């Protein structure tokens with residue numbers, strides 16, 4: 295990965311949306327936070343939705359509840375994104391069903407900070 299969008303990025307230091315953002319930046323990744331609550335996180339422009347993301351994002355990492363994730367994954371696929379990574383707790387079989395049908399690459403059960 296080079297350019298990573300982070301759905302559920304947060305300014306709350308107790309939340310994985312913040313911990314992951316800081317970790318990935320520390321590792322030299324370009325990270326684009328996505329969360330309607332924030333206009334910036336760590337000074338970085340924060341996107342309202344995945345529909346606004348630049349088309350050269352390599353992967354979208356999800357750290358939101360599965361009910362939210364299903365909606366966002368639909369938006370991401372509609373916007374042309376094809377690599378969707380779900381942090382443990384963000385996945386569901388309904389998401390799996392939609393993603394297998396859409397024919398996009400996805401990851402369940404793998405920890406992004408471990409894998410990077």
Ligand SMILES: *SCCNC(=O)CCNC(=O)[C@H](O)C(C)(C)COP(=O)(O)OP(=O)(O)OC[C@H]1O[C@@H](n2cnc3c(N)ncnc32)[C@H](O)[C@@H]1OP(=O)(O)O
Pocket residue numbers: 301302303304305306309310311328329330331342356357358359360362366381382383384404405406
């Ligand atoms: S793998 C080893 C490390 N472990 C993890 O990374 C564990 C990850 N999983 C979890 O923490 C939980 O299982 C999940 C459900 C993934 C996340 O739990 P949260 O309690 O943190 O979930 P929140 O409801 O607080 O959501 C996280 C942030 O996402 C924001 N959010 C809601 N809806 C959207 C949409 N549509 N788009 C972008 N972001 C969205 C929430 O508002 C929240 O951010 P805050 O601003 O902090 O509220």
